[PDB]
Amino acid sequence: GLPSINISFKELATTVKERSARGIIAMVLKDAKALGLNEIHEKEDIPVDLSAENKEYINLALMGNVNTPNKLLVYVIEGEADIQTALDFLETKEFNYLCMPKAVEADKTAIKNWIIKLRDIDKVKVKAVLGKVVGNHEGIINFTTEDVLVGEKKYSVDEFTSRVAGLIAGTPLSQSVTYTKLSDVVDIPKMTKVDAESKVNKGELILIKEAGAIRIARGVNSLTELTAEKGEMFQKIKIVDTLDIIHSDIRKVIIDDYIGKVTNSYDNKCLLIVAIKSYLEELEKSALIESDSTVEIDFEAQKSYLKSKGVDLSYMTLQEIKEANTGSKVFLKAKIKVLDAMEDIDLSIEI
C-alpha cells in the first residue's frame, strides 16, 4: 500500500506514551547574555551567563510533576527587543507549551494572537501559559495566582508560569492536574472560596489552600465560549493535550510522507485513512483513547473546496463527491473519544 507512511505511523505510535508523559516547553527570556536559542535538557545545560532570576525560572520549569519536562527551548532576546521576533523564530521549532516569565501586557497580546493563529490557521497545535490573560481559547492557559511563596521568595503570577508550564509538561496524558499538590509552595494569598470557584468557571488556572496543602484547583484552560462541537471537554488541559498530539502526529506524517510524494487519488486517500486508523488502533491499545475511532473523508470540507473551485455538485452522488479530485489538498475527519470522556470529539485534518 503506502509503506513509507505505515513505517512513520508505527514509529510515532511506539513513542506517543513517552512523548505524552514528558512535553517540551518554549521559554522566552529577557537578558543581555546567552542570546538566541538554548536547548536545556537538564540544570547543567543552563548557561551560567544568565541572571540568577532567569536561572530560577528555568529551574522552576524543570520540577515537572510525575516526570520532568523532556526539553526546554530557552530563546533569549535582548531587552527592548520585539517579542514578535522570538515568536517568528519558534514557528519552525517543536514545542508544546510557551511561557514568558517577564511578559508585559503588550507581550501577552502578541502571544495570544500568535498562539491562536498557529492553532486555528496554521494548524500547529501549540499552547501558552500566560499570566492574567482572558484568552477564551483552548490554546491559552490563564494562570492568575499572585504572590506565590516558594521557599522564602514571592514569585509574581507571570514568573510562576514557568512552574505551571513545567508541571503540565510533566503530567501524563492519562492524568489531570486538578488538585495536584505543589509541595514546594508553602503559602499563597488568602482567597475566599467564592472568588476561587468564580475564577475557575471564568477560565482561570489557580492555586488554592485545601486541607492544609496547596494544589491546583482545576486543570482548565481559558476557554469559556462553548459550542455544540467544542464544549466543556475543550476546557480541560489534559483533553486538549491528547487531541494535540494525535492531530500533530497525523498531520506530520501526511506532510512529511504523503503530500506531493503519493498521487492524491481517492484510492490513495483510502489507503492513508486505513494507515491513520491503524495508528489510532495502537493508541487505543496504549489507553489514550477509547475503542471505535473513525476516520473519513471530511465531506463538508471537501464539498466547500469543490464549490470554491467552480465545481457544480448538482449532478453528483455522495460517493462522487468523496472521490472527486482535490489536487494536493487532503480533507479528513477523525472521530475520537479520549479515555473516560463523555462525548465524542470530531477532529478536522486539512492539508
Author numbering: 4 to 354
Sentences from the paper on this structure:
A rather recently identified group of PTLBs are the R-type “diffocins” from Clostridium difficile, which constitute the only Gram-positive R-type PTLBs known to date. All R-type PTLBs consist of an inner needle-like rigid tube surrounded by a contractile sheath. Binding triggers extensive conformational changes in the baseplate, accompanied by contraction of the sheath, which, due to extensive interactions, drives the rigid inner tube into the cell envelope. Here, we have determined the crystal structures and SAXS envelopes of the R-type diffocin tube and sheath protein CD1364 and CD1363 in their pre-assembled monomeric state.
The R-type diffocin sheath protein CD1363 crystallized in space group C121 with one molecule in the asymmetric unit. Therefore, SAD data were collected from a crystal obtained from SeMet-labeled CD1363 protein. Because crystals of the labeled protein diffracted to higher resolution, the structure was refined against these data and the subsequent discussion refers to SeMet-labeled CD1363. In the crystal form discussed here, CD1363 is monomeric and comprises two domains. The domain arrangement is best described as a “Russian doll” system in which domain II (residues G26–S225; domain numbering according to Leiman and Shneider, 2012) is an insertion into domain I (residues G4–R25 and residues L226–I354). At the N-terminus, residues P6–A25 form a long α-helix that closely interacts with α-helices α9 and α10, which flank the central antiparallel three-stranded β-sheet. The larger domain II is composed of a central six-stranded β-sheet and five smaller β-strands flanked by four and two α-helices, respectively. Similar mesh-like organizations have been found in several T6SSs, indicating that these interactions are likewise conserved in assembled R-type PTLBs. Interestingly, the C-terminus in monomeric CD1363 also forms a β-strand (β14) that hydrophobically interacts with residues of α9 and α10 as well as with the same residues from the neighboring β-strand (β13 in CD1363) as observed in the pyocin particle, albeit within the same chain.
